[PDB]
């Protein structure tokens, strides 16, 4: 009507920063046949506006001059995705016909007025992504026809009103990302039509109401990242339409209720980061639909039940960081769909089962810091789908080249501190995307296959603390992405290859405790990320090359326990980031260069058991050094443990 159109024009005249490419260019002629046919966002019935849809039209303004008293037949209102600021007036509750009300994604502030509860015909209320604060008024519980309430991502405080139990037609309730507090009212459990209940990321406390067992149609229950406490009520097992139950990151205590096995529809169960204790009920194996079972970071004890072999759709099983113990039953890995088996930081014992990867789809197997032992099952040898294998801290045994097959998509493997023996196979080269190869402190013997240096995506290679023999070839330069190279504590012999000079991504190089002989390559001068170099405990000889002083990021340089001789270069002053320097147990002669006074970052120095003489340079490391950093030298003199200088 002319009066509705004139009133909307007056509201429009108040908008700011309007671009004249606005859709509202079409708001000109208030007569019908303009108003009801060509005004953007306006739809009428019998010449009167019943729908106002200005979503995402770049309006900046407020509702201060919104014409509440001029639009009596307003039925559908969508003002979302604009730049409306200010508050939500009580006058919005005078639109008696309103069915659909959306002010989301604006910059609205202040409290929700109780008058919204007067909208007795409302079907949908959306106020998401604003900065609304205060408590939800209890009068919202008068919206007896509403089927969806979404007020997520606001600044709401206070409890969820008990009056929400009167919202008998409510289907979806989305209140996540707020600061709602108090206990969940038990009246929520008596909403017969409820399908989705999302109260996650709030500050809710107290126990989950046992009334939730009356929620026979709820398919989604998200209440993660709250402060819920007490035990999960056994009545939850009567939510027999649940597809997804997420209670993670709460303060729940006591046992997992055995009645969860009653929920045959349940596909996703997230209970991690709680304080759940006791044994995993064997009835959890009856959750026939379960795909994604995550109960890590709890205080569960006892063994995993054999009934886990009945979970035939299982894909992800997260149990890390519990106190589970004992042997694992073959059923734990029996799902042909299993892709991730995550058991780290428990106290499991015995062998891996022969069911593992029987479906040919297992990807991530992580077992760190358990007590597993025995040989690798042949079905894991033959598991071509593996991406991540983490066995650190267990005691697996067997010949390493018999235990493992070929893994084309392997990305990361850590076998540190296991008990594997044998020689490395060239088969590892078929993991062309492998970025970390960690085999520290096994009983590996024999040579490094030359194919290893063709694993050009390697970023970490750690074969330390084995009994590996042979010489490093010049083609070591081919692992040109390597950033951490740890070959320490082996029996490698021959000269250190010059090709390491081309490993310009190297950050950390440990070749120590080997039998390397002859000179340190004089071309190691161009490793601009190298902060750690350890060549100690070898048989390296001749002079320390000046190229090492160009390794400007070095923080630690350890060349101790070699037969290096000649003088310490005064160009060491160039290592301005050097904190720790160990040259002890060598055959170095002459004076410690006075240029060490330039190295203000040095904190630790050891030159003991050399053939050095003369006074000690003036820097803090030398002043703070204990007598044994100097002992065993020829004629050092001081101004500790040294005779004073003349």
Ligand X SMILES: *[C@@H]1O[C@H](CO)[C@@H](O[C@@H]2O[C@H](CO)[C@@H](O)[C@H](O)[C@H]2NC(C)=O)[C@H](O)[C@H]1NC(C)=O
Ligand Y SMILES: *[C@@H]1O[C@H](CO)[C@@H](O)[C@H](O)[C@H]1NC(C)=O
Residues 201-230 that bind ligand X (CB under 6 A): none
- The β-bridge partners of 131 are 109
Minimum CB separation of residue 635 from ligand X in Å reads 25
Q: Which of 229, 259, 460, 512 binds ligand X (CB under 6 A)?
A: 512
HEC profile of 248-315 = CCCCCEECCCHHHHHCCCCCEEECCCCEEEECCCHHHHHCCCCCEEECCCCEEEECCCHHHHHCCCCC
The CA–CA distances, whole Å, from 336 to 233, 261, 567 equal 32, 21, 66
Tell me the C-alpha distance between 270 and 292, whole Å: 8
Residues 537-596 contacting ligand Y, CB under 6 A: none
In this complex, which beta carbon is closest to ligand Y, that of residue 104 or of residue 633? Answer: 104
How many Cα atoms sit within 13 Å of 499 on the Cβ side? Answer: 13
Q: Kindly tell me which of 228 and 524 has the beta carbon lying closer to ligand X.
A: 524
Q: For ligand Y, what does the binding mask look like between residues 78 and 97, x meaning CB under 6 A?
A: x-------------------
Within residues 77-116, the interface with ligand X by CB under 6 A covers: 109-110
State yes or no: residue 312 binds ligand X (CB under 6 A).
yes
- Is 100 a binder of ligand Y (CB under 6 A)? yes
CB of 625 to ligand X, least distance (A): 14
Q: Does 537 bind ligand X (CB under 6 A)?
A: yes
Burial letters 457-483, b for 16+ CB under 10 A, else e: ebbbbbbbbbebbebbeeebbbbeebb
Task: Indicate which of ligand Y, ligand X, none lies near residue 134 (CB less than 5 to 8 Å, by partner kind).
Answer: ligand X
Q: Please tell me whether residue 331 binds ligand X under the rule CB under 6 A.
A: yes
558 interface partner picked from ligand Y, ligand X, none, CB below 5 to 8 A per type: ligand X
Write each residue from 158 to 197 as x if it is in contact with ligand Y (CB under 6 A), else as -, in one continuous string. ----xx--x-------------------------------
- For β-strands 635-638 and 611-615, DSSP reports them as parallel
What is the dihedral angle through the alpha carbons of 31, 34, 35, 39, rounded to the nearest 10 degrees? -150
Binding string to ligand X for residues 25 to 64, with x set by CB under 6 A, is what?
--------------------xx-x----------------
Please answer whether residues 323 and 300 qualify as being in contact, where contact means their C-beta atoms are separated by less than 8 angstroms.
Answer: yes
Q: Of these partners, ligand X, ligand Y, none, which one is at the site of residue 580 (CB under 5 to 8 Å by kind)? A: ligand X
Q: Taking a C-beta distance cutoff of 8 angstroms, is the pair 238, 214 a contact?
A: yes
Query: What whole-number distance in Å separates Cα of residue 245 and Cα of residue 193?
Result: 18
Q: If binding is defined by CB under 6 A, does position 420 make contact with ligand Y?
A: no
> Which residue's CB is nearer to ligand X, number 209 or number 305?
305
Q: Which of 23, 51, 169, 573 binds ligand Y (CB under 6 A)?
A: 51
* Residue 178 touches ligand X, criterion: CB under 6 A: no
Q: What is the DSSP string of 21-80?
A: SSGGGG----STTTTTTTSTTEEEETTEEEEEE-TTS--EEESTT--GGG-TT--EEE--
Binding residues vs ligand Y (CB under 6 A): 16-17, 51, 53, 55, 76, 78, 100, 141, 162-163, 166, 253-254, 277-278, 301, 417, 441
């Amino acid at each position: 009507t002319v009066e509705e159109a004139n009133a909307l024009l007056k509201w429009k005249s108040t908008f700011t920063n309007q671009t004249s490419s606005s859709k509202l260019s079409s708001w000109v002629n208030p007569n019908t046949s303009s108003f009801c046919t060509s005004w953007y966002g306006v739809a009428c019935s019998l010449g009167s506006i019943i729908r106002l849809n200005l979503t995402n039209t770049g309006i900046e303004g407020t509702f201060e001059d919104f014409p509440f008293s001029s639009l009596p037949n307003l039925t559908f209102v969508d003002l979302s995705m604009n730049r409306f600021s200010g508050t939500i007036s009580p006058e919005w509750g005078r639109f008696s016909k309103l069915e659909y009300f959306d002010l989301s994604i604006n910059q609205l502030v202040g409290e929700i007025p109780p008058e919204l509860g007067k909208l007795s015909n409302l079907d949908t209320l959306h106020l998401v992504e604003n900065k609304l604060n205060g408590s939800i008024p209890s009068e919202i519980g008068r919206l007896t026809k509403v089927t969806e309430i979404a007020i997520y991502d606001n600044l709401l405080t206070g409890p969820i009103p008990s009056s929400f139990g009167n919202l008998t037609k409510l289907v979806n309730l989305y209140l996540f990302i707020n600061s709602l507090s108090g206990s969940i009212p038990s009246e929520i459990g008596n909403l017969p039509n409820l399908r989705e209940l999302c109260l996650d990321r709030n500050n809710l406390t107290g126990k989950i109401p046992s009334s939730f067992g009356n929620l026979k149609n709820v398919t989604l229950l998200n209440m993660f990242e709250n402060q819920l406490s007490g035990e999960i009520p056994p009545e939850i097992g009567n939510m027999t339409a649940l597809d997804t139950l997420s209670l993670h990151t709460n303060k729940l205590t006591g046992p997992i209720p055995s009645t969860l096995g009653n929920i045959k529809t349940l596909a996703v169960l997230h209970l991690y980061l709680n304080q759940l204790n006791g044994s995993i009920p064997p009835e959890l194996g009856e959750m026939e639909s379960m795909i994604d079972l995550e109960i890590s970071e709890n205080k569960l004890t006892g063994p995993v039940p054999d009934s886990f072999g009945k979970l035939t759709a299982l894909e992800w099983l997260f149990l890390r960081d519990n106190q589970l113990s004992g042997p694992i039953p073959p059923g734990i890995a029996n799902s042909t769909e299993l892709t991730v088996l995550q058991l780290d930081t428990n106290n499991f014992t015995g062998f891996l089962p022969d069911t593992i990867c029987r479906g040919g789809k297992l990807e991530n197997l992580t077992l760190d810091d358990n007590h597993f032992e025995g040989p690798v099952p042949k079905s894991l040898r033959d598991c071509k789908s593996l991406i991540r294998v983490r066995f650190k801290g267990n005691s697996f045994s067997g010949d390493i080249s018999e235990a493992f097959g070929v893994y084309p998509t392997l990305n990361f493997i850590d076998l540190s501190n296991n008990n594997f023996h044998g020689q490395l196979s060239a088969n590892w080269e078929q993991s062309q995307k492998l970025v970390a190869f960690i085999l520290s402190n096994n009983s590996i013997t024999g040579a490094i296959p030359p194919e290893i240096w063709n694993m050009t995506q390697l970023s970490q290679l750690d074969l330390s603390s084995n009994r590996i023999t042979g010489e490093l070839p010049e083609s070591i330069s081919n692992i040109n992405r390597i950033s951490k190279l740890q070959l320490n504590g082996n029996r490698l012999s021959g000269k250190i290859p010059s090709g390491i000079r081309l490993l310009t991504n190297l950050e950390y190089l440990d070749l120590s405790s080997n039998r390397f002989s002859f000179e340190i390559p004089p071309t190691l001068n161009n490793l601009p990320r190298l902060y750690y170099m350890n060549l100690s405990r070898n048989d390296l000889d001749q002079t320390i090359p000046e190229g090492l002083t160009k390794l400007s990021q070095l923080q630690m340089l350890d060349l101790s326990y070699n037969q290096l001789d000649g003088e310490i270069s005064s160009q060491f002053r160039s290592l301005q980031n050097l904190e720790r320097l160990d040259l002890s147990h060598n055959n170095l002669s002459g004076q410690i260069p006075p240029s060490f006074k330039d190295m203000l970052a040095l904190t630790h120095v050891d030159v003991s058991h050399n053939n050095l003489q003369g006074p000690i340079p003036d820097n803090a490391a030398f002043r703070n050094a204990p007598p044994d950093a100097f002992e065993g030298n020829k004629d050092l003199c001081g101004s500790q443990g040294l005779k004073p200088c003349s």
